[PDB]
C-alpha cells in the first residue's frame, strides 16, 4: 500500500498509470558528476527530461519506475529533481546490471544483500532516498557473479517485499534460469519481472513463465531500427523487430488469459553515454515521442486491434500497483 | 612554476619530499558514496588517512600524488579534506585504470582527450580542483582502447604540461611499448614515468629506458607477501619478491648512472575494496608504516648500503619536483 519514491513515501492509489521500466540516464557510476558536458551539461540533460516527462504526464503517465542501478549510474539527486518538476512520481531501484566496477564484482552474495538491503531501508547514497525495486541482470546463460547477484536481490526482497526486475536476452531464455535461481531462495514468482521479453516471438517460454505467476516485462515497445540497416550500432542494440510486432505480445498474452501478469513499458532515456556518442540522437528521431509512445501510440494500436480498455487499464495502473506494493 | 593540488597551486619548493605513487582509497567510481560502510565509515576512513599521513610528515614527507584515476573512484573532496587536516600537499589525477566502465571504454581518443583535458584545465567534477598528473595503464601488450587511452594522455600532457604515469606489468616489457606510443605522439621521455618497474629485476629494460629519458618509477618497495604463502590472493597481488629486493633496484640505477631517472614510493592505501574484503588488514599486517615505509625504512636500508644523503634527497626532492612541474 505504500511505496518508496524519489520524493519519499506515496500510497499505491496515487501512482496511476506507471511505466514499469524506464531511464532517466543510461550511464556509469560517477559519469555524469565527473564529465556533464558530454550530456551538453547536467542543466541540459536536466530540462531535457523534465520536458520529457511532462509531455509523457500529459499524455496521460504519472508515474515511471527508474529502473538504473549503481552501475547504469543511477543519480537519486538528478531523479529527485527531474521528479519535482515535472510532478512525475519516481521510483529508484537498487541491484546490478551487467557492468559492474571491480569493487562490485569481488563481492560475496552476504555483502551484495546488505547494499541491496542499505539502499532500501536506509537510502541512496546520502541522499535518504529509498529504492522501491531491485534491478537484475543475464546477457545468456549466467556469469557465477550474476548468480550471486540474483541471490542477493531475492533475500533483499524477501525481507523487504520490494520486487524484482530484470534484464534478459529473451531469445536465450535467460527467465527460466532467473526463474529457478530465484525459487531456489524463496522468492514468490508475483515479485518478479522478467524484463525485455518483448525481445522474443517465443510465447511458449512467456506464458509458462506467466502461468508460474511471474510478471512479463514487454519493455522496449519502440526499440526498433528497421530502415537503419547502414548503421551497424543503432541495429545491435534496437533490433529488426517492428513496435507493432512488440505491441502484439501484449494483445498475444492477453489472449491466452494473461492479462494480469502484464507490464508494459519503453526503456527510454534522456541520457545515453553507455554506447556509441550519436544513440541518443538516433533513439529520438526513430521515436519522437519518447516516453510518450506507451499512452500515445501503443494503447490506441491496441484499442484499433479489439484490446478494451478496461483490459489496458489493467495492465497499466493495477498490474503495476501490485507488483510495486511491498509484500 | 607552480604545481596543482587538491587545495589550490603550490610553488616547485613548497613540494619537498614526494611520494610520487600513491592512494588515499582504492576504490571504483561512485563505490564510496554508495557504500561507506565498506570502509567502516567515511568518517572512519578520513581519520585512518589523516593519521597515516601526518605519521609519514613527521618522517619527513610534504607531498603525495594520488594516482587515483576516475575508475580507481578517485574523490577529490575526500583528498581535500585529508589534506587539510594533515597538513600533506595532495596532487590528484586524471587518465584511466584498467576498470573503465561502459561510458568510459566506449569512448574515441577525441572525446578521451577532452576527459582528461577538463580534469586538469577545468576541474574534477564541480570542486574546482584541477589534476596535476595523468594516470594510464597497460597490463601486457596494450589492448585496442589502452592504445586510445595513451594517446590520449600523451595529448592531453603536450596541451597542459602535465606529466603522465603508468602501470606496467613490468615482467612482459610494457614500459617498451608505451614508450613507442608516446613517442609517437611527440610526447619527451622526461614528462614521463614508468611505473610498477620494481616487479623485475630485468636491470637491461629499466636502463634502456631512463637512457632514452624515461622515469623509472619504482613505487612499490614495501609490497611482499613473504610469510603468507597461505593466502591465495594477497600472494598473486604483492608477489614473492622482498622489501630488499625491490630497494636494491634504486641503488642498481644509482650504481649505472641514472640518479636523476628514479621515482620512488609504496603504492600504498587507506581504504582498498577494488580486490577482495581482508586485503587492507592483510597489507596493513606486512607494512605498518604504511606511507612512512619510504623515509623510515627504505632511506636507512639505503644509507647504511652507501648511498650518500645528497643522492636520497635528489631521487626524493629533486626528481619529483622536476617531473611534476609543468613543463
Ligand atoms: C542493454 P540495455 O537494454 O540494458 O541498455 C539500456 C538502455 C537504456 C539505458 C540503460 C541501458
Ligand atoms: C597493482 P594495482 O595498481 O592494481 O593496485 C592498486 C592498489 C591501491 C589502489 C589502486 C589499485
Ligand atoms: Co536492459
Ligand atoms: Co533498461
Ligand atoms: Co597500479
Ligand atoms: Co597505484
Excluded at 514487454?218 to 540497416?229: K, R, Y
Aim: aromatic fraction near 8%; glycine fraction near 8%; charged fraction near 20%.
Amino acid at each position: 500500500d505504500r511505496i518508496n519514491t524519489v520524493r519519499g513515501p506515496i500510497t499505491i492509489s496515487e501512482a496511476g498509470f506507471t511505466l514499469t521500466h524506464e531511464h532517466i540516464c543510461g550511464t556509469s557510476a560517477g559519469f555524469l558528476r565527473a564529465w556533464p558536458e558530454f550530456f551538453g551539461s547536467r542543466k541540459a540533460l536536466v530540462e531535457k527530461a523534465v520536458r520529457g516527462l511532462r509531455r509523457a504526464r500529459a499524455a496521460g503517465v504519472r508515474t515511471i519506475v527508474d529502473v538504473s542501478t549503481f552501475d547504469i549510474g543511477r543519480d537519486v539527486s538528478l531523479l529527485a529533481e527531474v521528479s519535482r518538476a515535472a510532478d512525475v512520481h519516481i521510483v529508484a531501484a537498487t541491484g546490478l546490471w551487467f557492468d559492474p566496477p571491480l569493487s562490485m564484482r569481488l563481492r560475496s552474495v552476504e555483502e551484495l544483500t546488505q547494499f541491496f538491503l542499505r539502499e532500501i531501508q536506509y537510502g541512496i547514497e546520502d541522499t535518504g532516498i529509498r529504492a522501491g525495486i531491485i534491478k537484475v541482470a543475464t546477457t545468456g546463460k549466467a556469469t557465477p557473479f550474476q548468480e550471486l547477484v540474483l541471490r542477493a536481490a531475492a533475500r533483499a526482497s524477501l525481507a523487504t517485499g520490494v520486487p524484482v526486475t530484470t534484464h534478459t536476452a529473451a531469445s536465450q531464455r535467460d527467465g527460466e534460469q532467473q526463474a529457478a535461481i530465484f525459487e531456489s531462495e524463496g522468492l514468490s514468482p508475483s515479485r518478479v519481472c522478467i524484463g525485455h521479453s518483448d525481445d522474443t516471438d517465443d510465447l511458449s517460454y512467456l506464458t509458462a513463465l506467466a502461468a508460474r505467476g511471474y510478471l512479463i516485462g514487454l519493455d522496449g515497445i519502440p526499440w526498433s531500427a528497421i530502415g537503419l540497416e547502414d548503421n551497424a550500432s543503432a541495429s545491435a542494440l534496437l533490433g529488426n523487430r517492428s513496435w507493432q510486432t512488440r505491441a502484439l505480445l501484449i494483445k498475444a498474452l492477453i489472449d491466452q488469459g494473461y492479462m494480469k501478469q502484464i507490464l508494459v513499458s519503453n526503456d527510454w532515456t534522456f541520457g545515453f553515454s553507455s554506447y556509441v556518442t550519436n544513440i541518443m540522437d538516433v533513439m529520438d528521431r526513430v521515436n519522437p515521442d519518447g516516453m510518450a509512445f506507451i499512452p500515445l501510440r501503443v494503447i490506441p494500436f491496441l484499442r484499433e486491434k479489439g484490446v478494451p480498455q478496461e483490459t489496458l487499464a489493467g495492465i497499466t495502473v493495477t498490474n503495476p500497483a501490485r507488483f510495486l506494493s511491498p509484500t
